PDB file of C-alpha atoms and ligand atoms in Angstrom:
ATOM      1  CA  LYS B  20      36.926 164.283 178.624  1.00 38.95           C
ATOM      2  CA  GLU B  21      38.863 166.737 176.366  1.00 40.06           C
ATOM      3  CA  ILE B  22      42.553 165.995 175.882  1.00 40.24           C
ATOM      4  CA  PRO B  23      44.716 168.934 177.044  1.00 38.36           C
ATOM      5  CA  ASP B  24      46.681 170.959 174.468  1.00 38.10           C
ATOM      6  CA  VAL B  25      49.795 170.843 176.709  1.00 41.23           C
ATOM      7  CA  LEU B  26      50.756 167.592 178.394  1.00 40.30           C
ATOM      8  CA  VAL B  27      52.772 168.079 181.564  1.00 40.07           C
ATOM      9  CA  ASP B  28      54.325 165.654 184.094  1.00 40.15           C
ATOM     10  CA  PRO B  29      55.306 166.050 187.754  1.00 40.18           C
ATOM     11  CA  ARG B  30      58.508 163.978 187.382  1.00 37.48           C
ATOM     12  CA  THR B  31      60.555 165.359 184.465  1.00 41.13           C
ATOM     13  CA  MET B  32      58.555 168.610 184.473  1.00 44.05           C
ATOM     14  CA  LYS B  33      58.725 168.806 180.659  1.00 44.92           C
ATOM     15  CA  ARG B  34      55.958 170.310 178.545  1.00 46.91           C
ATOM     16  CA  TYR B  35      54.630 168.290 175.602  1.00 49.62           C
ATOM     17  CA  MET B  36      52.502 170.040 172.961  1.00 50.65           C
ATOM     18  CA  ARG B  37      49.708 167.823 171.654  1.00 51.80           C
ATOM     19  CA  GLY B  38      49.685 168.024 167.908  1.00 50.98           C
ATOM     20  CA  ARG B  39      48.866 166.062 164.731  1.00 52.74           C
ATOM     21  CA  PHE B  40      46.548 163.062 165.166  1.00 50.69           C
ATOM     22  CA  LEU B  41      48.501 159.911 164.218  1.00 50.41           C
ATOM     23  CA  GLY B  42      45.815 157.221 164.718  1.00 49.94           C
ATOM     24  CA  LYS B  43      44.155 155.029 167.342  1.00 51.28           C
ATOM     25  CA  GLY B  44      43.896 151.406 168.519  1.00 51.59           C
ATOM     26  CA  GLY B  45      41.627 149.865 171.170  1.00 51.15           C
ATOM     27  CA  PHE B  46      40.123 153.270 171.996  1.00 48.98           C
ATOM     28  CA  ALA B  47      43.631 154.545 172.808  1.00 47.09           C
ATOM     29  CA  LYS B  48      44.366 157.635 170.722  1.00 44.33           C
ATOM     30  CA  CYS B  49      47.847 158.666 169.637  1.00 44.29           C
ATOM     31  CA  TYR B  50      49.193 162.094 168.822  1.00 46.64           C
ATOM     32  CA  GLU B  51      52.396 163.711 167.491  1.00 44.93           C
ATOM     33  CA  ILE B  52      53.765 165.534 170.579  1.00 45.50           C
ATOM     34  CA  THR B  53      56.563 168.117 170.693  1.00 46.96           C
ATOM     35  CA  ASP B  54      58.704 168.952 173.689  1.00 45.93           C
ATOM     36  CA  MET B  55      58.049 172.643 174.093  1.00 48.51           C
ATOM     37  CA  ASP B  56      61.606 173.260 175.280  1.00 46.32           C
ATOM     38  CA  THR B  57      63.961 171.009 173.186  1.00 47.34           C
ATOM     39  CA  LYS B  58      61.595 170.852 170.211  1.00 45.68           C
ATOM     40  CA  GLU B  59      61.832 167.100 169.659  1.00 46.02           C
ATOM     41  CA  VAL B  60      58.927 165.087 168.339  1.00 44.20           C
ATOM     42  CA  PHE B  61      57.508 161.983 170.028  1.00 43.78           C
ATOM     43  CA  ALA B  62      54.504 159.787 169.634  1.00 40.71           C
ATOM     44  CA  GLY B  63      52.213 160.550 172.588  1.00 38.83           C
ATOM     45  CA  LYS B  64      49.950 157.651 173.481  1.00 35.74           C
ATOM     46  CA  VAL B  65      46.899 158.977 175.291  1.00 38.49           C
ATOM     47  CA  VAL B  66      44.685 156.446 177.133  1.00 34.15           C
ATOM     48  CA  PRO B  67      41.620 157.559 179.171  1.00 38.28           C
ATOM     49  CA  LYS B  68      41.140 156.556 182.821  1.00 39.43           C
ATOM     50  CA  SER B  69      37.547 155.729 181.931  1.00 40.34           C
ATOM     51  CA  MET B  70      38.946 152.803 180.066  1.00 41.01           C
ATOM     52  CA  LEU B  71      40.985 151.677 183.084  1.00 42.72           C
ATOM     53  CA  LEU B  72      38.327 151.649 185.769  1.00 45.49           C
ATOM     54  CA  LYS B  73      38.814 147.998 186.780  1.00 47.96           C
ATOM     55  CA  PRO B  74      42.022 147.140 188.820  1.00 47.59           C
ATOM     56  CA  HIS B  75      42.407 144.168 186.382  1.00 49.80           C
ATOM     57  CA  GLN B  76      42.879 146.590 183.441  1.00 51.36           C
ATOM     58  CA  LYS B  77      45.171 148.822 185.545  1.00 48.55           C
ATOM     59  CA  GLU B  78      47.623 145.892 186.126  1.00 46.99           C
ATOM     60  CA  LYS B  79      47.525 144.753 181.934  1.00 50.48           C
ATOM     61  CA  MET B  80      49.003 148.200 181.302  1.00 48.76           C
ATOM     62  CA  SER B  81      51.365 148.414 184.334  1.00 46.24           C
ATOM     63  CA  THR B  82      53.141 145.182 183.148  1.00 41.82           C
ATOM     64  CA  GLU B  83      53.202 146.481 179.579  1.00 41.58           C
ATOM     65  CA  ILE B  84      54.799 149.817 180.688  1.00 40.66           C
ATOM     66  CA  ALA B  85      57.267 147.921 182.968  1.00 40.84           C
ATOM     67  CA  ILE B  86      58.442 145.592 180.179  1.00 40.32           C
ATOM     68  CA  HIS B  87      58.741 148.391 177.608  1.00 39.01           C
ATOM     69  CA  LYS B  88      60.633 150.608 180.092  1.00 41.62           C
ATOM     70  CA  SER B  89      63.427 148.022 180.271  1.00 41.14           C
ATOM     71  CA  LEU B  90      63.909 147.937 176.505  1.00 41.73           C
ATOM     72  CA  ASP B  91      66.508 149.830 174.481  1.00 39.18           C
ATOM     73  CA  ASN B  92      67.284 148.608 170.945  1.00 39.81           C
ATOM     74  CA  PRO B  93      67.416 150.141 167.499  1.00 37.36           C
ATOM     75  CA  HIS B  94      64.657 147.705 166.362  1.00 38.11           C
ATOM     76  CA  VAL B  95      62.305 148.166 169.260  1.00 42.83           C
ATOM     77  CA  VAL B  96      60.082 151.251 169.612  1.00 44.57           C
ATOM     78  CA  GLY B  97      61.957 153.635 171.991  1.00 42.90           C
ATOM     79  CA  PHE B  98      60.198 154.101 175.353  1.00 41.59           C
ATOM     80  CA  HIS B  99      60.894 157.665 176.598  1.00 38.29           C
ATOM     81  CA  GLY B 100      58.729 157.827 179.772  1.00 39.57           C
ATOM     82  CA  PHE B 101      55.185 157.789 181.015  1.00 41.22           C
ATOM     83  CA  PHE B 102      52.943 159.814 183.352  1.00 41.09           C
ATOM     84  CA  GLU B 103      49.469 159.845 184.863  1.00 44.37           C
ATOM     85  CA  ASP B 104      46.980 162.772 185.031  1.00 44.82           C
ATOM     86  CA  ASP B 105      43.524 163.673 186.401  1.00 46.14           C
ATOM     87  CA  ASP B 106      41.852 161.927 183.426  1.00 46.38           C
ATOM     88  CA  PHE B 107      44.518 160.283 181.200  1.00 46.12           C
ATOM     89  CA  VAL B 108      47.590 158.093 181.205  1.00 43.97           C
ATOM     90  CA  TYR B 109      50.259 159.414 178.788  1.00 47.31           C
ATOM     91  CA  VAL B 110      52.976 157.222 177.270  1.00 49.48           C
ATOM     92  CA  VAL B 111      55.863 158.897 175.381  1.00 45.80           C
ATOM     93  CA  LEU B 112      57.285 156.761 172.550  1.00 46.42           C
ATOM     94  CA  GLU B 113      59.702 156.966 169.582  1.00 46.96           C
ATOM     95  CA  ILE B 114      57.786 158.332 166.559  1.00 47.71           C
ATOM     96  CA  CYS B 115      57.216 156.219 163.460  1.00 49.12           C
ATOM     97  CA  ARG B 116      55.804 158.383 160.700  1.00 45.14           C
ATOM     98  CA  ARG B 117      55.509 155.631 158.082  1.00 43.30           C
ATOM     99  CA  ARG B 118      52.757 153.438 159.581  1.00 42.81           C
ATOM    100  CA  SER B 119      53.415 149.748 159.812  1.00 47.06           C
ATOM    101  CA  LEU B 120      54.222 146.735 157.550  1.00 45.79           C
ATOM    102  CA  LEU B 121      50.428 146.113 157.458  1.00 45.34           C
ATOM    103  CA  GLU B 122      49.801 149.349 155.517  1.00 45.43           C
ATOM    104  CA  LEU B 123      52.716 148.426 153.234  1.00 46.57           C
ATOM    105  CA  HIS B 124      51.391 144.896 152.668  1.00 46.77           C
ATOM    106  CA  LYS B 125      47.800 146.090 151.892  1.00 44.43           C
ATOM    107  CA  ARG B 126      49.227 148.409 149.257  1.00 44.75           C
ATOM    108  CA  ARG B 127      51.889 146.139 147.873  1.00 43.91           C
ATOM    109  CA  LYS B 128      50.642 142.585 148.340  1.00 46.26           C
ATOM    110  CA  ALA B 129      53.496 140.114 147.666  1.00 50.17           C
ATOM    111  CA  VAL B 130      56.751 142.016 148.030  1.00 49.37           C
ATOM    112  CA  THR B 131      60.059 141.175 146.282  1.00 48.15           C
ATOM    113  CA  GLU B 132      62.407 138.547 147.959  1.00 46.74           C
ATOM    114  CA  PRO B 133      65.083 141.159 148.799  1.00 44.13           C
ATOM    115  CA  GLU B 134      62.490 143.234 150.616  1.00 46.98           C
ATOM    116  CA  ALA B 135      61.407 140.266 152.675  1.00 44.76           C
ATOM    117  CA  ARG B 136      65.027 139.670 153.600  1.00 45.13           C
ATOM    118  CA  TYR B 137      65.494 143.272 154.726  1.00 47.31           C
ATOM    119  CA  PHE B 138      62.308 143.490 156.738  1.00 48.05           C
ATOM    120  CA  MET B 139      62.677 140.029 158.331  1.00 47.01           C
ATOM    121  CA  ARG B 140      66.330 140.538 159.275  1.00 47.05           C
ATOM    122  CA  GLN B 141      65.639 143.755 161.169  1.00 46.76           C
ATOM    123  CA  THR B 142      62.591 142.178 162.827  1.00 47.41           C
ATOM    124  CA  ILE B 143      64.440 139.060 163.855  1.00 46.21           C
ATOM    125  CA  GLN B 144      67.310 141.158 165.251  1.00 43.53           C
ATOM    126  CA  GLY B 145      64.623 142.890 167.307  1.00 41.19           C
ATOM    127  CA  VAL B 146      63.104 139.610 168.427  1.00 37.58           C
ATOM    128  CA  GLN B 147      66.543 138.244 169.360  1.00 35.42           C
ATOM    129  CA  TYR B 148      67.103 141.170 171.690  1.00 36.43           C
ATOM    130  CA  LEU B 149      63.782 140.487 173.333  1.00 38.91           C
ATOM    131  CA  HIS B 150      64.513 136.751 173.743  1.00 41.60           C
ATOM    132  CA  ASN B 151      68.009 137.474 175.091  1.00 44.41           C
ATOM    133  CA  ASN B 152      66.333 139.712 177.679  1.00 43.64           C
ATOM    134  CA  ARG B 153      63.787 136.900 178.530  1.00 43.45           C
ATOM    135  CA  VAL B 154      60.916 138.828 176.851  1.00 43.46           C
ATOM    136  CA  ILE B 155      58.356 137.122 174.625  1.00 39.50           C
ATOM    137  CA  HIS B 156      56.186 139.489 172.502  1.00 39.32           C
ATOM    138  CA  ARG B 157      53.388 136.980 171.898  1.00 41.02           C
ATOM    139  CA  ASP B 158      51.573 139.318 169.415  1.00 43.43           C
ATOM    140  CA  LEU B 159      54.026 139.707 166.511  1.00 45.96           C
ATOM    141  CA  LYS B 160      52.232 140.873 163.374  1.00 45.50           C
ATOM    142  CA  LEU B 161      52.521 143.237 160.308  1.00 43.55           C
ATOM    143  CA  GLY B 162      50.549 145.839 162.212  1.00 43.41           C
ATOM    144  CA  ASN B 163      53.177 145.768 165.061  1.00 45.14           C
ATOM    145  CA  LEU B 164      56.244 146.172 162.852  1.00 46.05           C
ATOM    146  CA  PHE B 165      56.212 150.031 162.644  1.00 46.01           C
ATOM    147  CA  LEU B 166      58.309 151.986 160.156  1.00 45.52           C
ATOM    148  CA  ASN B 167      60.183 155.305 160.543  1.00 48.83           C
ATOM    149  CA  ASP B 168      61.217 157.851 157.850  1.00 47.06           C
ATOM    150  CA  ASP B 169      64.421 155.846 157.179  1.00 44.59           C
ATOM    151  CA  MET B 170      62.251 152.689 156.646  1.00 43.36           C
ATOM    152  CA  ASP B 171      63.658 150.968 159.721  1.00 43.33           C
ATOM    153  CA  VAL B 172      61.544 148.354 161.499  1.00 41.10           C
ATOM    154  CA  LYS B 173      60.515 149.179 165.046  1.00 41.80           C
ATOM    155  CA  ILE B 174      58.670 146.506 167.019  1.00 39.12           C
ATOM    156  CA  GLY B 175      55.963 147.876 169.289  1.00 36.73           C
ATOM    157  CA  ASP B 176      52.734 147.020 171.162  1.00 40.28           C
ATOM    158  CA  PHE B 177      53.805 145.075 174.264  1.00 40.63           C
ATOM    159  CA  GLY B 178      50.240 144.772 175.514  1.00 41.08           C
ATOM    160  CA  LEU B 179      50.548 140.936 175.470  1.00 44.04           C
ATOM    161  CA  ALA B 180      54.265 140.701 176.281  1.00 43.47           C
ATOM    162  CA  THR B 181      55.551 138.616 179.221  1.00 44.17           C
ATOM    163  CA  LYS B 182      58.779 137.955 181.043  1.00 42.83           C
ATOM    164  CA  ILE B 183      60.093 134.459 181.571  1.00 42.48           C
ATOM    165  CA  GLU B 184      61.057 134.518 185.206  1.00 42.79           C
ATOM    166  CA  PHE B 185      62.710 131.059 185.445  1.00 43.98           C
ATOM    167  CA  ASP B 186      64.223 128.289 183.280  1.00 44.52           C
ATOM    168  CA  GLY B 187      61.859 125.975 181.409  1.00 43.69           C
ATOM    169  CA  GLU B 188      58.821 128.099 182.405  1.00 43.15           C
ATOM    170  CA  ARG B 189      55.700 127.362 180.397  1.00 42.68           C
ATOM    171  CA  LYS B 190      52.895 130.003 180.242  1.00 42.06           C
ATOM    172  CA  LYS B 191      49.180 129.245 180.237  1.00 40.89           C
ATOM    173  CA  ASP B 192      47.683 132.725 180.518  1.00 40.54           C
ATOM    174  CA  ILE B 193      48.634 132.815 167.315  1.00 43.53           C
ATOM    175  CA  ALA B 194      50.601 129.587 167.909  1.00 46.50           C
ATOM    176  CA  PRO B 195      49.044 126.074 168.375  1.00 46.31           C
ATOM    177  CA  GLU B 196      50.449 125.965 171.979  1.00 43.74           C
ATOM    178  CA  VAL B 197      48.316 128.898 173.001  1.00 40.42           C
ATOM    179  CA  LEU B 198      45.155 127.559 171.364  1.00 39.79           C
ATOM    180  CA  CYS B 199      45.566 124.120 172.886  1.00 42.38           C
ATOM    181  CA  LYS B 200      46.384 125.780 176.314  1.00 45.77           C
ATOM    182  CA  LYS B 201      49.226 123.228 176.620  1.00 45.68           C
ATOM    183  CA  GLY B 202      51.887 125.780 177.588  1.00 45.73           C
ATOM    184  CA  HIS B 203      54.398 127.950 175.731  1.00 48.00           C
ATOM    185  CA  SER B 204      57.561 130.009 175.866  1.00 44.36           C
ATOM    186  CA  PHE B 205      59.851 131.736 173.317  1.00 44.50           C
ATOM    187  CA  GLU B 206      58.861 129.664 170.283  1.00 44.62           C
ATOM    188  CA  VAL B 207      55.522 131.411 169.793  1.00 42.32           C
ATOM    189  CA  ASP B 208      57.323 134.409 168.501  1.00 41.42           C
ATOM    190  CA  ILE B 209      59.069 132.235 165.876  1.00 39.81           C
ATOM    191  CA  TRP B 210      55.624 130.878 164.710  1.00 40.45           C
ATOM    192  CA  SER B 211      54.367 134.504 164.312  1.00 39.13           C
ATOM    193  CA  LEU B 212      57.526 135.427 162.418  1.00 39.32           C
ATOM    194  CA  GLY B 213      56.884 132.508 160.025  1.00 39.65           C
ATOM    195  CA  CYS B 214      53.382 133.825 159.381  1.00 38.02           C
ATOM    196  CA  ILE B 215      54.844 137.308 158.640  1.00 36.79           C
ATOM    197  CA  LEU B 216      57.485 135.939 156.225  1.00 35.01           C
ATOM    198  CA  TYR B 217      54.775 133.899 154.469  1.00 32.52           C
ATOM    199  CA  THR B 218      52.476 136.929 154.225  1.00 27.66           C
ATOM    200  CA  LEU B 219      55.230 139.173 152.811  1.00 26.09           C
ATOM    201  CA  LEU B 220      56.344 136.728 150.124  1.00 27.43           C
ATOM    202  CA  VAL B 221      52.927 135.333 149.182  1.00 26.45           C
ATOM    203  CA  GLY B 222      50.664 138.391 149.627  1.00 29.39           C
ATOM    204  CA  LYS B 223      48.156 136.763 151.998  1.00 25.84           C
ATOM    205  CA  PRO B 224      48.326 135.279 155.559  1.00 22.96           C
ATOM    206  CA  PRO B 225      48.767 131.459 155.669  1.00 19.00           C
ATOM    207  CA  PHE B 226      45.678 130.682 157.763  1.00 20.58           C
ATOM    208  CA  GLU B 227      43.351 133.503 156.843  1.00 22.08           C
ATOM    209  CA  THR B 228      39.685 132.771 156.212  1.00 21.14           C
ATOM    210  CA  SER B 229      36.416 134.779 156.474  1.00 21.68           C
ATOM    211  CA  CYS B 230      35.496 132.732 159.537  1.00 22.12           C
ATOM    212  CA  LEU B 231      37.414 132.991 162.842  1.00 21.56           C
ATOM    213  CA  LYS B 232      36.596 129.418 163.934  1.00 23.64           C
ATOM    214  CA  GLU B 233      37.888 127.949 160.643  1.00 24.21           C
ATOM    215  CA  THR B 234      41.121 129.883 161.090  1.00 25.35           C
ATOM    216  CA  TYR B 235      41.748 128.370 164.504  1.00 24.75           C
ATOM    217  CA  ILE B 236      41.056 124.812 163.222  1.00 27.67           C
ATOM    218  CA  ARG B 237      43.649 125.172 160.469  1.00 28.02           C
ATOM    219  CA  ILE B 238      46.276 126.375 163.003  1.00 24.02           C
ATOM    220  CA  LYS B 239      45.509 123.342 165.259  1.00 24.96           C
ATOM    221  CA  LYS B 240      45.846 120.904 162.411  1.00 21.82           C
ATOM    222  CA  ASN B 241      48.735 122.768 160.798  1.00 23.77           C
ATOM    223  CA  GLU B 242      46.743 123.264 157.583  1.00 22.34           C
ATOM    224  CA  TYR B 243      48.542 125.750 155.249  1.00 19.02           C
ATOM    225  CA  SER B 244      49.985 125.545 151.770  1.00 20.94           C
ATOM    226  CA  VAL B 245      53.140 127.440 150.667  1.00 19.57           C
ATOM    227  CA  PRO B 246      52.467 127.980 146.912  1.00 24.63           C
ATOM    228  CA  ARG B 247      54.723 126.379 144.277  1.00 23.99           C
ATOM    229  CA  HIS B 248      55.795 129.886 143.094  1.00 28.83           C
ATOM    230  CA  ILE B 249      57.758 130.505 146.297  1.00 27.93           C
ATOM    231  CA  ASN B 250      61.547 129.907 146.165  1.00 27.26           C
ATOM    232  CA  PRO B 251      62.268 126.340 147.701  1.00 33.28           C
ATOM    233  CA  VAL B 252      64.866 127.948 150.020  1.00 35.11           C
ATOM    234  CA  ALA B 253      62.216 130.415 151.448  1.00 35.00           C
ATOM    235  CA  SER B 254      59.641 127.604 151.414  1.00 35.49           C
ATOM    236  CA  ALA B 255      61.898 125.378 153.573  1.00 36.61           C
ATOM    237  CA  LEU B 256      62.387 128.138 156.131  1.00 34.57           C
ATOM    238  CA  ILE B 257      58.661 128.934 156.432  1.00 32.64           C
ATOM    239  CA  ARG B 258      57.801 125.191 157.053  1.00 32.67           C
ATOM    240  CA  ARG B 259      60.399 125.000 159.802  1.00 27.91           C
ATOM    241  CA  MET B 260      59.257 128.280 161.398  1.00 28.21           C
ATOM    242  CA  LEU B 261      55.663 127.083 161.379  1.00 27.67           C
ATOM    243  CA  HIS B 262      56.444 123.572 162.601  1.00 24.75           C
ATOM    244  CA  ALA B 263      53.731 121.822 164.561  1.00 28.93           C
ATOM    245  CA  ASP B 264      56.306 120.887 167.168  1.00 29.24           C
ATOM    246  CA  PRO B 265      57.510 123.980 168.995  1.00 29.53           C
ATOM    247  CA  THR B 266      60.850 122.255 169.696  1.00 27.91           C
ATOM    248  CA  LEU B 267      61.588 121.613 166.031  1.00 28.72           C
ATOM    249  CA  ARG B 268      61.141 125.357 165.192  1.00 28.46           C
ATOM    250  CA  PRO B 269      64.473 127.221 164.740  1.00 27.63           C
ATOM    251  CA  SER B 270      65.704 129.541 167.546  1.00 26.79           C
ATOM    252  CA  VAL B 271      65.964 133.220 166.868  1.00 25.98           C
ATOM    253  CA  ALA B 272      69.715 132.902 166.687  1.00 28.97           C
ATOM    254  CA  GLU B 273      69.681 130.369 163.816  1.00 29.42           C
ATOM    255  CA  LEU B 274      67.175 132.453 161.833  1.00 29.92           C
ATOM    256  CA  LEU B 275      69.750 135.054 160.729  1.00 30.33           C
ATOM    257  CA  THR B 276      72.216 132.366 159.592  1.00 33.76           C
ATOM    258  CA  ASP B 277      69.621 130.571 157.420  1.00 31.09           C
ATOM    259  CA  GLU B 278      70.310 130.069 153.710  1.00 30.14           C
ATOM    260  CA  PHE B 279      67.425 132.446 152.870  1.00 31.19           C
ATOM    261  CA  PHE B 280      69.314 135.369 154.339  1.00 29.59           C
ATOM    262  CA  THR B 281      72.514 134.500 152.418  1.00 29.38           C
ATOM    263  CA  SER B 282      71.366 133.013 149.079  1.00 29.10           C
ATOM    264  CA  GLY B 283      70.253 136.242 147.356  1.00 31.19           C
ATOM    265  CA  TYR B 284      70.557 140.046 147.394  1.00 32.66           C
ATOM    266  CA  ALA B 285      70.066 141.536 150.858  1.00 32.89           C
ATOM    267  CA  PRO B 286      69.648 145.360 150.594  1.00 29.39           C
ATOM    268  CA  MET B 287      71.069 147.264 153.597  1.00 27.29           C
ATOM    269  CA  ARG B 288      68.628 150.199 152.971  1.00 27.00           C
ATOM    270  CA  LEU B 289      65.172 150.632 151.427  1.00 25.07           C
ATOM    271  CA  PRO B 290      63.681 153.801 149.918  1.00 22.92           C
ATOM    272  CA  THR B 291      60.295 155.135 151.001  1.00 24.76           C
ATOM    273  CA  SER B 292      59.006 154.187 147.483  1.00 24.70           C
ATOM    274  CA  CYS B 293      58.648 150.576 148.764  1.00 23.16           C
ATOM    275  CA  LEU B 294      55.479 151.689 150.548  1.00 26.97           C
ATOM    276  CA  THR B 295      53.662 151.883 147.211  1.00 29.27           C
ATOM    277  CA  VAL B 296      55.769 150.298 144.458  1.00 32.32           C
ATOM    278  CA  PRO B 297      58.512 147.642 144.078  1.00 29.68           C
ATOM    279  CA  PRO B 298      62.135 149.015 144.157  1.00 30.83           C
TER     280      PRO B 298
HETATM  281  C1  KWT C   7      48.608 151.087 171.735  1.00 29.07           C
HETATM  282  O1  KWT C   7      51.115 151.194 171.622  1.00 29.07           O
HETATM  283  C2  KWT C   7      50.896 151.835 170.403  1.00 29.07           C
HETATM  284  C3  KWT C   7      49.597 152.129 169.764  1.00 29.07           C
HETATM  285  C4  KWT C   7      48.436 151.737 170.513  1.00 29.07           C
HETATM  286  C5  KWT C   7      47.235 152.128 169.740  1.00 29.07           C
HETATM  287  O2  KWT C   7      46.265 152.629 170.228  1.00 29.07           O
HETATM  288  O3  KWT C   7      47.199 151.835 168.285  1.00 29.07           O
HETATM  289  C6  KWT C   7      48.491 151.980 167.605  1.00 29.07           C
HETATM  290  C7  KWT C   7      49.100 150.600 167.306  1.00 29.07           C
HETATM  291  O4  KWT C   7      48.161 149.847 166.445  1.00 29.07           O
HETATM  292  C8  KWT C   7      48.397 148.451 166.552  1.00 29.07           C
HETATM  293  C9  KWT C   7      49.478 152.843 168.402  1.00 29.07           C
HETATM  294  C10 KWT C   7      48.801 154.222 168.731  1.00 29.07           C
HETATM  295  C11 KWT C   7      50.756 153.220 167.731  1.00 29.07           C
HETATM  296  C12 KWT C   7      52.051 152.892 168.384  1.00 29.07           C
HETATM  297  C13 KWT C   7      52.119 152.203 169.719  1.00 29.07           C
HETATM  298  O5  KWT C   7      53.243 151.958 170.290  1.00 29.07           O
HETATM  299  C14 KWT C   7      53.286 153.314 167.667  1.00 29.07           C
HETATM  300  C15 KWT C   7      54.654 153.254 168.310  1.00 29.07           C
HETATM  301  C16 KWT C   7      55.516 154.213 167.458  1.00 29.07           C
HETATM  302  C17 KWT C   7      54.473 155.027 166.731  1.00 29.07           C
HETATM  303  O6  KWT C   7      54.821 155.899 165.850  1.00 29.07           O
HETATM  304  C18 KWT C   7      53.112 154.710 167.127  1.00 29.07           C
HETATM  305  C19 KWT C   7      52.679 155.746 168.175  1.00 29.07           C
HETATM  306  C20 KWT C   7      52.064 154.661 165.998  1.00 29.07           C
HETATM  307  C21 KWT C   7      50.720 153.912 166.421  1.00 29.07           C
HETATM  308  O7  KWT C   7      50.308 153.095 165.322  1.00 29.07           O
HETATM  309  C22 KWT C   7      49.489 153.875 164.374  1.00 29.07           C
HETATM  310  C23 KWT C   7      47.968 153.658 164.342  1.00 29.07           C
HETATM  311  O8  KWT C   7      50.046 154.548 163.526  1.00 29.07           O
END
């Protein structure tokens, strides 16, 4: 199935011109799309109906779209509408031309402490908004923290996001709670954030190994080592964020007010040079 040059929808009746290829993920291709009337650029997510044959797969996406539709926050990827077609499902999103924190990390390795502060603060502010709206991301990673031209963090990929419907709800359908199938809520996002902060400051993920089975065992037994080179203040925060007990992990609200975010220089802006070299 060939993707149309002009993407049209019955609802808004706006015309989107399919342009520059931006990348793919899980056989879902993404393109730089331009509104043929207003001339504003968006990231057009194109996913084929041949991938969503099973009603199980149709659902997921419907939950993903529903959750993302509700969201509006300067640190969450802007959702600007979706529409079906004969062959494809098109999702219109805020465009992030500067890839993700994963591409930055692979190029930079261990970043400077002030950079970690900047990136984490914006990400946590994003996660706080999600948690205040009873949304758990569940898949927070460097590859999901997208960057725009101004180097602002935008959280995306809600393909594993859920809504907490009631108080004290534990979910059964990566943190130790999920691997043990014991039940989880908001504190799985804090765990992931701890992994991210570790990876930014150290240069490598805390549980990474060549074997997938060995990685899961280390998570279960809480086997990681924050190197001696890391600032004790940052080291203390990581250990609390990655606590074996989900209850002893800090809430998203007390993350911002931690010593780490107040002890040293916290830049309010970052230049695009941080993609390749230290500032
Ligand atoms: C599924 O929601 C999104 C994406 C997919 C996908 O197929 O891969 C990537 C994400 O990789 C983890 C997709 C295309 C991307 C986005 C997305 O929401 C981003 C949101 C804002 C943006 O600029 C997008 C479209 C970039 C894109 O990630 C890549 C590969 O650049």
